[PDB]
């Protein structure tokens, strides 16, 4: 998502987050920390929006 | 030309991670349960002490009689 682009995706800010060890217990802990990250690209997004056709 | 964004009013809310309440530790407790257990046992003492005192005159009602 950031090392690719897919739209105009490259104009929001988020970080993405990474595991220290590697197991099941800090692969659980990328899905609880990227559902706060997801809400921060959504308050992100309805700033944005350009008034146009579809 | 009826389209959504309003001008202003906004938050956000956050992201953050925050419940660190605490919570009467590190030898606060300890010693509510070391103060709590000995006075358990001071209350004993006086009941089993007691009690071992009424338990002799239960005897001594056998032994007047039984000739």
Known sequence: ?54 | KQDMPPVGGYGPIDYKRNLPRRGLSGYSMFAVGIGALLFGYWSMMKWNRERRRLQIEDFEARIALMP
């Open chain 1, 1 to 54: 998502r950031k090392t690719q682009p897919y739209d105009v995706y490259d104009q929001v800010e988020f970080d993405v987050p990474i595991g220290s060890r590697g197991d099941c217990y800090d692969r659980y802990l990328c899905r609880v920390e990227e559902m706060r990250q997801s809400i921060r690209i959504i308050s992100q997004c309805l700033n944005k929006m350009p008034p146009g056709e579809i």
